[PDB]
Amino acid sequence: EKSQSLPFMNRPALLDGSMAGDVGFDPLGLSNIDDVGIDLYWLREAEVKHCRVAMLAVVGILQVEIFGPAPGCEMATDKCQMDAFWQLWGAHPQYIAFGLIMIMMIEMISGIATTQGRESGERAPGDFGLDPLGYGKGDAAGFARLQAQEIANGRLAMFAAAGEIVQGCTTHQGALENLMTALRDNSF
Amino acid sequence: AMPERLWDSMVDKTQRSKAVPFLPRAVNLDGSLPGDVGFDPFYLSSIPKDFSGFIQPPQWEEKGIPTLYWMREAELKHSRVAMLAWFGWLATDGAFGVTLRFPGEIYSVENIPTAYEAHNALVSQGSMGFLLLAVGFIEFCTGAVLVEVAKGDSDREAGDFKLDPLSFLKGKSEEEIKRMKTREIANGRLAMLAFGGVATQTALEGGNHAFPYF
Amino acid sequence: AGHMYRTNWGIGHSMKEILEAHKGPFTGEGHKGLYEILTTSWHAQLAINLAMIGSLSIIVAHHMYAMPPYPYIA
Amino acid sequence: KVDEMPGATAPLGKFDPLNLATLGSESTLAWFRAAELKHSRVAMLATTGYLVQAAGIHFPGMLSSDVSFESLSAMKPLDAWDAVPEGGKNQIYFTIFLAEFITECKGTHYTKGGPLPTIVFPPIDFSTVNPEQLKTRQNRELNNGRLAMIAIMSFVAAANIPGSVPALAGNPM
């Protein structure tokens, strides 16, 4: 009857309790929309993709700052987020637009699958069937934990990824550089 | 003038208000709400407009909030902000003995000598702009309820959130809850006028910026 | 200007209640019926549209010789 | 019942003149209970952590790479706070930050009738001891903290306002 996360208000009607991470947090009623080609199925497919991109982006920033670039790249610089990106583009832009076309082929097909996956309810939101390791032929209670840990880490990574981009473009220093700077100023 | 006047559907010509005994009582006032003495000399509770229209427009669907309910919800929020703002304005000025300031040079005495220049100084820096976004998130996550109550789908009291982390009132008699609620209102009312005092004097031609602002 | 009409969400204007509100004591019923006209007949549409587009092309020619917008064209 | 519990000793008994234990619910009193339990343990370590090193106890060697334990030869014990470096002052908080979690993440919280904050790192089992003798110890634990909460406020007021405390102002600190 009442939202677990907003206990002063009613729980939204379509937030059944079945998806991982569902604590009934939707105060504005966005799960209710069924117009302009988007709904709870499209919003969940959006969220899981935002999760995944942001989880990779945090490790990708921390990788080439702690350990530097991959072998075959040079002229390392202050921040690894923007300063290296325009630098590599100017250095050798072939591998970076190789990927942009390869992502483009993957996205056009995953977008067809999302529209085909809602018309016939046999594609789980987020599910591309990628389980080469077999986590999921195991315990259903243990696999339901893996579903919630993907969402919980992915939600936290969205703030961290959007964090490291914006304070990279603001301070023009590295992300671990910004953490040690903030440690110095609020030394307390 | 020959229609039925609007003074009759919102003025109740039988009883009189406790405050101002020469005016009749507004129709939506009762003794029900805490901190009530029937005080409404301008008959604001009686305006038959839906003030939830500001959040969501009236053309979205059939819906109506009581005017009295939206006022109480405002007055509680005006109370809460002013209780903290008056307290936070003096505490950073050193009116309670210790000049309470955040760690770090940017919020120290040398960059900001008193709270009067903290709004313009922090606005340029950005710490002011950050708090605007942080409040924005809360307001949006807490102002959607007004819609629910206006659709008749909720039985929540005005300004009531399940925020009692220390369990002040769990299991208290309605007499005990009402008295406590009156304290939120009476202390809130005094602090709305306290902040209006402090912010006004401190901005005229004279007037210092010490703990006493006269 | 592309938010002045009502589609799927309550907010906005219906073209029908606009026109039907405009009636004076010289005009009688005023604009009643012009919806059925302009949503069930393609000829009535062109009659407005061609008159407008034709007037526009005249308007366009008067503004391009007096305020020449391209470089080296004047 | 406020009189029958750890912290109600002989010379006062139930000490609540302004009736603060009645002010909330039973969950309210359990919060104040383990507040005073925690206020005690911080003040007992700060009162003792003040006496010692005001007398020159002096860890041998280096605290950090260049800011070694010269913080005791001259500066008062209220000082040598900013002399401790930031990375040294950071680990302290984070061991505390971690210790505040197991305190909160027990099977039953304490305001729901659960156990009060237990030792975080070395968890020697403490369940076994005679509960008659246990009640005498929790009176001893709180009363020493009551005395230490006053005493650490004495030590601050002596360091700010000279002559604010008679038989204690003639002390080099």
Ligand code: CLA
């Ligand atoms: C109406 C309340 C209010 C407001 C708007 C401010 C605003 C300000 N204070 Mg201030 N303060 C307040 C109350 C308030 N204070 C109170 C009550 C205290 C004492 C307990 C203080 C103690 C204080 C200190 C010690 C200092 C300031 C400072 C400042 C300035 C910079 C702070 C900043 O950028 O945010 C940074 C802070 C945050 C982002 C904290 C998070 C705030 C959260 C998001 C608010 C939402 C939670 C809120 C409590 C409501 C709960 C939800 C609700 C539904 C119940 C800014 C002018 C600084 C300054 O410049 O001094 C001159 C400074 O050093 N304040």
Ligand code: CLA
């Ligand atoms: C409020 C608590 C508190 C705080 C903030 C500090 C802070 C500080 N102490 Mg200190 N200290 C404390 C309590 C505290 N101490 C206590 C209770 C004792 C033992 C009686 C000491 C003994 C001590 C010595 C001998 C010295 C310091 C020093 C220092 C400074 C350097 C950091 C360091 O090595 O600390 C180390 C802090 C500790 C080892 C104590 C905390 C340990 C935790 C609480 C576990 C408790 C251990 C044990 C079970 C309890 C024994 C207490 C009693 C039975 C003897 C720093 C300012 C040094 C300095 O720079 O001199 C100015 C120095 O020479 N302290």
Ligand SMILES: CC(=O)O[C@H]1CC(C)(C)C(=C=C/C(C)=C/C=C/C(C)=C/C=C/C=C(C)/C=C/C=C(\C)C(=O)C[C@@]23O[C@]2(C)C[C@@H](O)CC3(C)C)[C@](C)(O)C1
């Ligand atoms: C310099 C810098 O960077 O920061 C700047 C930022 C910024 C934003 C520019 C600034 C500002 C603007 C601020 C703070 C403006 C605040 C304005 C504020 C808060 C103004 C309250 C008025 C309250 C009134 C009038 C109450 C009247 C009360 C009246 C009229 C009554 O009749 C009360 C009474 O009848 C009752 C109801 C019944 C009885 O029971 C009692 C009686 C009969 C007496 C500052 C301050 O300059 C600081």
Ligand code: KC1
């Ligand atoms: C000083 C503040 C004051 C305001 C602000 C105000 C405002 C309105 N008065 Mg009012 N008023 C007085 C004071 C005020 N009136 C006084 C001293 C007299 C005696 C001289 C007086 C007399 C009448 C009559 C005879 C009628 C009337 C109405 C409305 C009406 C709604 C209009 C609507 O929305 O249709 C509004 C907004 C009419 C009504 O109820 O029906 C149409 C109606 O007949 N008034």
Ligand SMILES: CC1=C(C#C/C(C)=C/C=C/C(C)=C/C=C/C=C(C)/C=C/C=C(C)/C=C/[C@@]23O[C@]2(C)C[C@@H](O)CC3(C)C)C(C)(C)C[C@H](O)C1
């Ligand atoms: C046709 C079709 C479909 C479709 C479709 C459509 C319209 C697909 C289109 C998708 C589209 C248009 C996807 C854009 C992505 C842009 C990105 C990722 C930008 C990243 C940019 C980033 C991460 C940062 C960029 C920077 O600029 C920043 C911020 C700072 C600058 O200094 C420079 C840099 C570069 C650093 C459906 C919908 C599936 C239905 C049907 O089934 C089939």
Ligand SMILES: CCCCCCCCCCCCO[C@@H]1O[C@H](CO)[C@@H](O[C@H]2O[C@H](CO)[C@@H](O)[C@H](O)[C@H]2O)[C@H](O)[C@H]1O
């Ligand atoms: C520093 C500024 C100086 C201002 C000092 C002002 C002194 C504060 C007033 C002391 C009153 C607080 O003490 C508290 O009072 C409230 C309400 O009366 C009581 O409230 C509680 O008990 C009373 C019985 O009296 C019940 O009716 C009530 O249901 C219950 O909540 C508490 O039992 C008591 O603990």
